[PDB]
Design an enzyme around this catalytic site. Structure first.
Site, mmCIF file in Angstrom:
data_model
loop_
_atom_site.group_PDB
_atom_site.id
_atom_site.type_symbol
_atom_site.label_atom_id
_atom_site.label_comp_id
_atom_site.label_asym_id
_atom_site.label_seq_id
_atom_site.Cartn_x
_atom_site.Cartn_y
_atom_site.Cartn_z
ATOM 1 N N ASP A 8 0.852 -1.202 0.000
ATOM 2 C CA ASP A 8 0.000 0.000 0.000
ATOM 3 C C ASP A 8 0.888 1.252 0.000
ATOM 4 O O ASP A 8 1.353 1.672 1.082
ATOM 5 C CB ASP A 8 -0.909 -0.028 1.216
ATOM 6 C CG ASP A 8 -1.840 1.158 1.257
ATOM 7 O OD1 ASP A 8 -1.940 1.884 0.253
ATOM 8 O OD2 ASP A 8 -2.484 1.347 2.323
ATOM 9 N N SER A 12 -0.550 15.740 -11.970
ATOM 10 C CA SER A 12 -0.781 15.408 -13.374
ATOM 11 C C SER A 12 -1.014 16.682 -14.195
ATOM 12 O O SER A 12 -1.583 17.652 -13.661
ATOM 13 C CB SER A 12 -1.972 14.414 -13.501
ATOM 14 O OG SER A 12 -2.347 14.184 -14.782
#
Ligand code: NA
Length: 330
Positions: free
Chosen positions: A35, A199
């Site tokens: 994770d 992004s």
């Protein structure tokens, strides 16, 4: 040193991925969920409330000649999905894919929430976010990666998740055979303890690319792609009969649909998520309503590049003094 381990989807939908981890002496092999969105290595154990264990493999510290109680230490964690676990702490020898750490904090669960009990395939979590998020009190503990780092050939790990197939976690090296083209590196903020990056925009299907900054985290422990409601509405508007269902808890679409791809930017580079990756199948057995793999992050307070996005790429988690992320097509 290096390590290399195969990671395997737990079910036909890629709901999560498990990776075998050796704990203790002699080794006890447990299947952990790696994770990058959390920083605790915790396991089902011989201490876990018996009614909360249903098929998981357990760690038994009393059977390990290298286990030592970390006296006075406790832990307690709550995840984004509402699940939780807590317990006490041992140090022991932990190996992943041939890479060994001695003195790793192994957090032994005394209590787990119902979603963990109900998932027989996941024996615990191995956190790979920054150690500032580790929940051990009163002495915070280091991740497996942070303890391994100084011994690694390069201070990196890579995630190469498969679509409906196994993939790989490597520690300490880049496998230049595992991706196509070049790796594009992007800046990371560690201020919230995550692999947080920006992004450069998105496209839906064959549509034009929209240049826009989207701050979010690279999270292998989250199944879906969670983005701003504007971006998500723009995607599902291209699927006839898709809608947001308050009763189901997100966007659903007709199982008869063919889904468009979704592209996200990494600097001037582009990662394309095929439409098939965005189908999470019937909402209930036999339904013709299917659950979408792109969902709104509104109310979650962060955007999350979970497995739907990551498994379209070869992803480098660069833990050099200034961390960075890298993305390549594959
Ligand atoms: Na679900």
């Amino acid at each position: 040193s290096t390590g290399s381990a195969t990671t395997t989807p737990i079910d036909s939908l890629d709901d999560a991925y498990i990776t075998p981890v050796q704990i203790g002496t002699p080794a006890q092999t447990l299947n952990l969920d790696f994770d990058t969105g959390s920083s605790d290595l915790w396991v089902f154990s011989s201490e876990t409330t018996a009614s909360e264990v249903d098929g998981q493999t357990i760690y038994t510290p009393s059977k390990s000649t290298t286990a030592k109680l970390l006296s006075g230490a406790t832990w307690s964690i709550s995840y984004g999905d509402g699940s939780s676990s807590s317990g006490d702490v041992y140090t022991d020898t932990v190996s992943v894919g041939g890479l060994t750490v001695t003195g790793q904090a192994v957090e032994s669960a005394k209590k787990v929430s119902s979603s963990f009990t109900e998932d027989s395939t996941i024996d615990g979590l191995l956190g790979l976010a920054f150690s500032t998020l580790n929940t051990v009190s009163p002495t915070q503990q280091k991740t497996f990666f942070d303890n391994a780092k100084a011994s690694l050939d390069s201070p990196v790990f890579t995630a190469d998740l498969g679509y409906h197939a196994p993939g790989t976690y490597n520690f300490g090296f880049i496998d230049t055979t595992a991706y196509t083209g070049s790796i594009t590196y992007t800046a990371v903020s560690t201020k919230q303890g995550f692999w947080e990056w920006t992004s450069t925009g998105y496209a839906v299907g064959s549509g034009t690319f929209k240049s826009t900054s989207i701050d979010g985290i690279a999270d292998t422990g989250t199944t879906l792609l969670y983005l701003p409601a504007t971006v998500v509405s723009a995607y599902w508007a291209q699927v006839s009969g898709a809608k947001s269902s308050s009763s189901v808890g997100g966007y659903v679409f007709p199982c008869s649909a063919t889904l468009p791809s979704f592209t996200f930017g990494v600097g001037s580079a582009r990662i394309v998520i095929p439409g098939d990756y965005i189908d999470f199948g019937p909402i209930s057995t036999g339904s013709s309503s299917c659950f979408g793999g792109i969902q709104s992050s509104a109310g979650i307070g962060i955007n999350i590049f979970g497995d739907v996005a990551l498994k379209a790429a070869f992803v480098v988690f660069n833990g050099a003094t200034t961390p960075t992320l890298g993305f390549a097509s594959k």
